Each structure stands twice: as structure tokens, then as C-alpha cells.
Design a protein around this ligand. Sequence first.
Ligand code: 8W7
Ligand code: ZN
Length: 108
Amino acid sequence: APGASIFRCRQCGQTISRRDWLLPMGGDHEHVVFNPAGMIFRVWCFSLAQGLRLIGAPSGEFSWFKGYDWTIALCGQCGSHLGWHYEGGSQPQTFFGLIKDRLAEGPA
Ligand SMILES: O=C1CC[C@H](N2Cc3c(OCc4ccc(CN5CCOCC5)cc4)cccc3C2=O)C(=O)N1
Ligand SMILES: [Zn+2]
């Protein structure tokens, strides 16, 4: 009964990621960040995620992670904004920054 091992979309229950997949970027999986619109996000970095829909082409504008371009990551099921896919960087080349409070943690 591994009780807190997967992350689902809080809105619809789509399978998104796993506690096992948390990635400490610059020493911490958690990054508290603000966009140009002044919205605060508690971002959890994951090496891997699924069940998302990545919108458009990458942009480096206002990237919170040096060397990485982002794409908006929506829940592929309900279209809720869950965070961003990061690419074009180094070690790793790619990862997901997901908004912690938009995910529900629960058993495998
Ligand atoms: O890593 C990341 C992931 C993406 C994330 N971003 C960028 C971003 C935007 O970025 C496009 C954009 C940015 C700025 C403007 C207009 N300016 C002009 C001067 O500054 C204030 C208003 C228009 C469009 C537009 C809307 C939301 C976000 C958002 O959440 C972020 O910040 N860092
Ligand atoms: Zn959803």
C-alpha cells in the first residue's frame, strides 16, 4: 500500500508523474517563482511526466531555469495549466516544472 507515490491532475485525476521522478534542480526539487504577471508558483521539478499536452514552440523569455526554454504544459485530459516542459538546456537537456498545488498525491 504505497500511499503517496503518484501525482494526478487535481481537477480530473489524469496520471501526471511520480514521487520517484522528483528532480533536485540546483539542489532542491522545489522552486518558488513569479511570472511577469506577478503570479507566484511553487514549482516541483520532475525528470519525467505523462498525460500532459505541450502547447506551441519553446521560448527562453523569462525562463526561471538558466539555459532552458519552456513550453506550457496543460493536463492532456482537462486542459488545466499544470506547469511547463523545459528543453534546450544541459544536464539534463529536459525536465518538467509542475505547480505542486495543481497536483493530487496518492497511491500507485
Ligand atoms: O520559466 C518560466 C515559464 C514561463 C513563465 N511565464 C512567462 C509568461 C509570459 O511571457 C510572455 C510575455 C511576457 C511579457 C509580456 C509583456 N510584458 C512586457 C514587460 O514586462 C511586463 C509585461 C508579454 C508576454 C506571459 C504570460 C505568462 C507567463 C508565465 O507564466 C515564466 O515567467 N518563467
Ligand atoms: Zn486534468
